[PDB]
Design an enzyme around this catalytic site. Structure first.
Site, PDB file in Angstrom:
ATOM      1  CG  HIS A  43     118.680  18.718  39.636  1.00 43.92           C
ATOM      2  ND1 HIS A  43     118.675  18.489  40.996  1.00 43.92           N
ATOM      3  CD2 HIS A  43     118.207  17.585  39.067  1.00 43.92           C
ATOM      4  CE1 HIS A  43     118.244  17.263  41.235  1.00 43.92           C
ATOM      5  NE2 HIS A  43     117.951  16.693  40.081  1.00 43.92           N
TER       6      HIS A  43
ATOM      7  N   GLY B 277     115.960  13.557  48.330  1.00 39.85           N
ATOM      8  CA  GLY B 277     117.319  13.162  48.632  1.00 39.85           C
ATOM      9  C   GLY B 277     117.804  11.947  47.873  1.00 39.85           C
TER      10      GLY B 277
ATOM     11  CB  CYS C 157     118.340  13.565  42.978  1.00 43.47           C
ATOM     12  SG  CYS C 157     116.623  14.120  42.939  1.00 43.47           S
TER      13      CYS C 157
HETATM   14  O1  Y1L Z   1     115.024  18.008  42.140  1.00 42.75           O
HETATM   15  C1  Y1L Z   1     114.867  19.439  42.209  1.00 42.75           C
HETATM   16  C2  Y1L Z   1     113.744  19.899  41.223  1.00 42.75           C
HETATM   17  C3  Y1L Z   1     112.703  20.860  41.617  1.00 42.75           C
HETATM   18  S1  Y1L Z   1     111.733  21.068  40.282  1.00 42.75           S
HETATM   19  C4  Y1L Z   1     112.547  19.993  39.176  1.00 42.75           C
HETATM   20  C5  Y1L Z   1     112.304  19.637  37.843  1.00 42.75           C
HETATM   21  C6  Y1L Z   1     113.126  18.754  37.206  1.00 42.75           C
HETATM   22  C7  Y1L Z   1     114.214  18.186  37.885  1.00 42.75           C
HETATM   23 CL1  Y1L Z   1     115.222  17.063  37.036  1.00 42.75          CL
HETATM   24  C8  Y1L Z   1     114.463  18.533  39.213  1.00 42.75           C
HETATM   25  C9  Y1L Z   1     113.632  19.436  39.870  1.00 42.75           C
END
Ligand code: Y1L
Ligand code: Y1L
Ligand code: NA
Lengths: 302, 305
Positions: A41, A143, A145
């Protein structure tokens, strides 16, 4: 003596953390050999998180859309591919600090250490467990992730988790390093929530054995139980069912203390019914379920 | 979100851990520049420990009586000296992984990370607090001596602790890196005990602020109090006195949450008097006091090294 939530030494993972930037989004990557692993993502805008078509987003990217930074050095990307929910960025430099490593997908109840990182820079290390509902109860900010979870048995780093999101209840979801999510979660902003969580019964039992090892016996009693009678009681306290596999894994801690597994189960039954009456076990006023049988043997005997 | 007992990344200190053997006793050493630091009781035997003359015991040992192994490679001792209760072993080779570092002495109530080691090999890392009675509640087994505690400030490792001994209650005692003990303890086989401990009040408040930051709010109320009134309550419950300096430190947290320090001491006032009523705070049934105000800020901020 003493008993602590102990993480593995993080130095081998520290040497692997890089920063990955795509567009306006920046997060962490794991740099092993000539590959950098990160959550896919990273290529999403905020518009995309509702219903991202990752194949369509990726096809519009070229290698130089990905800025990889290892400390001060810019790493140059020479290829990119998507494996499930991780991006794998091929770079022109192998990591000279690449440790002995493997990828392992873990089961609920398994523990591991997390190296929290921001902008490719490690912030702290703490110990976690994979909850029965496939979430983890971490400490992550925006941050973080791309931060990873790992075990180090001997000097091989077993990477088992990469952080992808925080669910509404403040718990955290992620993938193995093959990009497969733990649990039913998706890298998509949907109405997804953690299932009802349960206490990791085999882990509490191991932590009770650890209390006997460190010299505590006040919670034992003269009673025993059948395995099924114990499970009938435990599930009324939202405890995980205890299986024969769990009984076998507890064997060595039963021998070291001389307390049969179902006798310790009887003591857990009484603890659930009575509480601790103003007492503590290994310094806690709650029953701890984030120490595995393996963890107890490592910290109490070496 | 989330709040966990968090240790500093230990990589910079893992590269300084060596194994030091003198005779049959073997423990851990800290290898910085061309000096290896370790507890001086490495030179003692079982009968030496009951009344050691470390001066006379050292003047009898020689450079060759110290086997220092940096994991794989053997280090050659070219010199030995004492500073207080740590032994300084000059080695022929400077550590190539020596980080930027200082030796600091921490105050009771301050926290630090412990890298537990056995035979010069790091085995685990965890977060500790210097108790008001100058012990720490660590996790150590035989051979852990010489393990070190540290904080990291930017690129600089601040070494503050080196493990020396365990007390009968299972808590642990050690020195700073200049060899001065924390607490009224000595490195000899004598009757030693940890004094009566107290609870680090400023840290409990910081942890309540961490709980409000994470959405735990049931313990807040409409009341406030005074420093003088609350400290009467703190003394009754074996809590450290709260000073005006503590209130100033909790300022950054009292702003981020919009809850005044005296306002929160009113919450702790009521928690100490009435209890928890079955509810938990940040997943705990006890009042946690091993998080400093800075610890709570740095974890709810994202500071990295
Ligand atoms: O981190 C960005 C993000 C915004 S909504 C969402 C839902 C699932 C995952 Cl994995 C990431 C995000
Ligand atoms: O393991 C060495 C040892 C035996 S008794 C005693 C008391 C204090 C300290 Cl520091 C060390 C020792
Ligand atoms: Na109040």
């Amino acid at each position: 003596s003493g008993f602590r939530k102990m993480a593995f030494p993080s130095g081998k993972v520290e040497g692997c953390m890089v920063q990955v930037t795509c567009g306006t989004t920046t997060l962490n990557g794991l740099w092993l050999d000539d590959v950098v692993y990160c959550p896919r993502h990273v290529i999403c805008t905020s518009e995309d998180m509702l219903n991202p078509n990752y194949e369509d987003l990726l096809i519009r990217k070229s290698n130089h859309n990905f800025l990889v930074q290892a400390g001060n050095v810019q790493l140059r990307v020479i290829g990119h591919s998507m494996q499930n929910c991780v991006l794998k960025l091929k770079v022109d430099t192998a990591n000279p600090k690449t440790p002995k490593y493997k990828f392992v997908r873990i089961q609920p109840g398994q523990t591991f250490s997390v190296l929290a990182c921001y902008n490719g820079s490690p912030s702290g290390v703490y110990q976690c467990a994979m909850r029965p509902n496939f979430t983890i109860k971490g400490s992550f900010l925006n941050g973080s992730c791309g931060s990873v979870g790992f075990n180090i048995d001997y000097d091989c780093v077993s990477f088992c988790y990469m952080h992808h999101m925080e669910l509404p209840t403040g718990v955290h979801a992620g993938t193995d390093l093959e990009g497969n999510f733990y649990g039913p979660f998706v890298d998509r902003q949907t109405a997804q929530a953690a299932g009802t969580d349960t206490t990791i019964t085999v882990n509490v039992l191991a932590w009770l054995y650890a209390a006997v090892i460190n010299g505590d016996r006040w919670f034992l009693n003269r009673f025993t139980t059948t395995l099924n009678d114990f499970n009938l009681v435990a599930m009324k306290y939202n405890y995980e069912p205890l299986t024969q596999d769990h009984v076998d894994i507890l064997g060595p801690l039963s021998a070291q203390t001389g307390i049969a597994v179902l006798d310790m189960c009887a003591s857990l039954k009484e603890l659930l019914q009575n509480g601790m009456n103003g007492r503590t076990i290994l310094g806690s006023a709650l029953l701890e379920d984030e120490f595995t049988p393996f963890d107890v043997v490592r910290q109490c005997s070496g």
